[PDB]
């Protein structure tokens, strides 16, 4: 019907620090002495904010005629996401993807006499898997109801453009929702303790930190490229190597002025000193450590599965549902290097990683364990080794060998321990492999 | 078997066991009784016999 | 069993040998910096305290 408002004023939801009127008006050589000798002032600050709800007002020469609405104005808004460059290609049909990586192997010594009878002897490569599949199915609902919507505007022209600006609106929130997703995934990640812990003492506490930070960072930069590889900077243990054309680093705009600011103003020849790897600012972590996060081009495993839109009208009430449906996949990839630079109070060991995390081993069988302390200090811990098969007969030794029990069926947990807490209250960090066993 | 589940090949315990054939049943039912109807009725609701 | 595509399968196959070279270089380099830790334990050479 005929919806109309009544005696509402022109300071909805204003809580002003001072009345500026009341202070030009008592003024006595203050700094609002230079508003006095305006004329219109009062006019000029009722509405000068803003109007939320307007009201008829009517001519000051003719009582009877009603002032008119000069100009109308549509704003157009467009917004993407900056982390799209990291998405790969889609899949139409089925869920799981497999990622397959093979490690390198041992020498041995030549021995003539030996290899008489070992011919055909065999052993086993070293490889290892990682599995993702789709996570995310969402939509988006918009409502148009365009014959009760014509009352409301005069030019077909801004018609048009308030119909195409509720439609654009669906995908600027899409983007947004796409850019918060991407950002979930590193965040996740550094919250379950995957990533290598860089420990820095503060970005902003003083320039000394800053440097040292930036001789961090390039240093850290420098070891993943060796053409021989490493093992040290990825979450699966394996030996594999970088290209610094394909690293990314990723940080924030505070970090970024500070950089601009301590750094390189001061700084004679100064690409001595500024970033290495391809930079990309963002807003910010949610984690409360993390300032820089550097990782591998293939880090990302971002696919979609679906992207679709549907429409249907309603014969009754004269108006069209607008669904847009979005399904992706969003993981990582735990064979690529991924470090994070963390300021403040981190614990001394983060991961332990035990190389074979699947094994099926024989009854009389046996099988080597190898086990990576991720460490942010440069103290060496050890680590100590049970089995939780629960029969006798099976048995790991100190240095990660499991003897399996002639006559037993069960599941077995291989479980590497390290003592990083002090004594009354220990601190324990846990790494697993799960063995199954043949007869 | 009924609910398969996960099995890993013997020489590489890395790997999993694809499927490597389905196949979809197919069957049809018929009714042996059809040869006792009538034809059919367009227009109409009520059928008289004298 | 672990494949239905013969392209995975060779792919595969090859990255075992290309795994054999890899650890070849490895243990090369590892061999040459074991040269100049030896050297240095043997005390040959010239030592300039920093």
Known sequence: MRITFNDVKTSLGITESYDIVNAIRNSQGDNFKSYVPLATANNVAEVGAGILINQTVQNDFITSLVDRIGLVVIRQVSLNNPL???????????????????????????????????????????????????????????????????????????????????????????????????????????????FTTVKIDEPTSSTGALTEFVKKMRATARKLTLPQGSRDWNSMAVRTRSYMEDLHLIIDADLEAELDVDVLAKAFNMNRTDFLGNVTVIDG???????????????????????????????????????????????????????????????????????????????????????????????????????????????????????????????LTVKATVDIGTEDKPKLVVGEAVVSIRP
């Not at 048009?160 to 996740?188: G, H, Q, R, T």
Request: net charge negative.
């Open 84 to 194: 799209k460059k990291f998405k790969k290609g889609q899949i139409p049909l089925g869920r799981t993807i497999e990622e397959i990586y093979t490690d390198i192997t041992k020498e041995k010594q030549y021995d003539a006499e030996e290899a008489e009878q070992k011919v055909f002897e065999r052993e086993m490569p070293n490889v290892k898997t990682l599995f993702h599949e789709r996570n995310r199915q969402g939509f988006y609902h918009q409502t148009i109801q365009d014959d009760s919507l014509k009352t409301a505007f005069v030019s077909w022209g801004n018609f048009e453009s308030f119909v195409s600006s509720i439609i654009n609106a669906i995908y600027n929130s899409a983007e947004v929702d796409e850019y918060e997703y991407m950002k979930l995934l590193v965040d996740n990640y550094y919250s379950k303790g995957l």
């Open 285 to 411: 972590f949610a984690s409360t450590g993390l300032e820089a996060v550097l990782v591998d081009k293939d880090w990302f495993m971002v696919y979609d599965n679906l992207h679709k839109m549907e429409t249907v009208r309603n014969p009754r009430g004269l108006y069209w549902n607008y669904y847009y449906h979005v399904w992706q996949t969003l993981s990582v990839s735990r064979f690529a290097n991924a470090v994070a630079f963390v300021s403040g109070d981190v614990p001394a060991v983060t991961q332990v990683i035990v190389s074979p995390n699947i094994a099926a081993v024989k009854q009389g069988g046996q099988q080597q364990f190898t086990a990576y302390v991720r460490a942010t200090n440069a103290k060496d811990h050890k680590v100590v080794w049970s089995v939780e098969g629960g029969s006798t007969g099976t048995a790991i030794t100190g240095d990660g060998l499991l003897s399996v029990s002639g006559n037993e069926d069960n599941q």
